[PDB]
Design a protein around this ligand. Structure first.
Ligand SMILES: CCCCCCCCCCCCCCCCCC(=O)OC[C@H](COP(=O)([O-])OCC(O)COP(=O)([O-])OC[C@@H](COC(=O)CCCCCCCCCCCCCCCCC)OC(=O)CCCCCCCCCCCCCCCCC)OC(=O)CCCCCCCCCCCCCCCCC
Ligand SMILES: CCCCCCCCCCCCCCCCCC(=O)OC[C@H](COP(=O)([O-])OCC(O)COP(=O)([O-])OC[C@@H](COC(=O)CCCCCCCCCCCCCCCCC)OC(=O)CCCCCCCCCCCCCCCCC)OC(=O)CCCCCCCCCCCCCCCCC
Ligand SMILES: CCCCCCCCCCCCCCCC(=O)OC[C@H](COP(=O)(O)OCCN)OC(=O)CCCCCCCCCCCCCCC
Lengths: 57, 87
């Protein structure tokens, strides 16, 4: 892709597209984790997942 | 805060006061990917059968003896205060 095409594609981005993508991909969706080292303080899966969707709204 | 608390055996997250572990890999799935009510009946039936066949007499013997002496005591006490019992 030419730099003109990249600039045009980036320019189209607005805040509502970001909101839509974050709502359809990140908001309350399954995650895959992987930990190595001293992970005694890392809580279990359900408590980790519960933080990916805020409850105030 | 501080206050220099005492000595316990629980601690908290991060420092639980346990021996150092090494080379213990652990895998688990997501609750939304696994299926509840999968293999529940079979495993539960096998576990109940094994528990009944294993513990079993441990409870069976004392309760049976107690019930037998209960029945015998009731029968004898009813008989003795009747007409023929006192004679
Ligand atoms: C009505 C519902 C109100 C319950 C509060 C609530 O929704 O959680 C706080 C939560 C605040 O967290 P957030 O910023 O929205 O992000 C959610 C996270 O997942 C953060 O979630 P989390 O994983 O950190 O879990 C927090 C959650 C832990 O999970 C529980 O629900 C705990 C249950 C314990 C007893 C149940 C009560 O704690 C609470 O529910 C709050 C305290 C519970 C009662 C406090 C007792 C004494 C104070 C009175 O919701 C709000 O306070 C906003 C309004 C929501 C409903 C009103
Ligand atoms: C006086 C007190 C004396 C005793 C005191 C201590 C007793 C503790 C209370 C027991 C209550 C908890 C309990 O066992 O049940 C919770 C238990 C969940 O506990 P869990 O994580 O499976 O762990 C217990 C296992 O049994 C793990 O144990 P297991 O693997 O050794 O299996 C033993 C198995 C025994 O094995 C069997 O009986 C064979 C399977 C036939 C199932 C029988 C009932 C169904 O036990 C059961 O699964 C019993 C099921 C229901 C118990 C009935 C509650 C009566 C309370 C007694 C008072 O609930 C069920 O399993 C219910 C399954 C079906 C419910 C979903 C229905 C579909 C959705 C509804 C849509 C309709 C709209
Ligand atoms: C005292 C009680 C008497 C009244 C009983 C009726 C109460 C009605 C409750 C309705 C069912 C609960 C729905 C919430 C489901 C949910 O949202 O679960 C979510 C949360 C956390 O999970 P998560 O966000 O990490 O999931 C992550 C998803 N990705 O789980 C809970 O907080 C469990 C709360 C259940 C209610 C508390 C019961 C224990 C109180 C009694 C024991 C202590 C007694 C103290 C003396 C009184």
């Amino acid at each position: 892709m030419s730099p003109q095409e990249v600039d045009l594609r980036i320019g189209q981005i607005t805040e509502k597209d970001v909101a839509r993508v974050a709502s359809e991909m990140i908001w309350d969706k399954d995650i895959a984790v992987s930990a190595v080292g001293s992970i005694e303080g890392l809580l279990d899966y359900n408590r980790i997942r519960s933080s990916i969707s805020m409850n105030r709204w | 805060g501080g206050a220099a608390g005492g000595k316990t055996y629980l601690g908290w997250w991060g420092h639980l006061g346990g021996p150092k572990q090494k080379g213990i890999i652990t895998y688990s799935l997501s609750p939304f990917q696994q299926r509840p009510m999968a293999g529940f009946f079979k495993t539960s039936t096998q576990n109940m059968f094994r528990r009944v066949m294993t513990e079993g007499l441990y409870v069976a013997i004392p309760f049976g003896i107690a019930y037998y002496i209960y029945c015998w005591g009731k029968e004898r006490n009813e008989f003795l205060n009747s007409k023929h019992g006192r004679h």
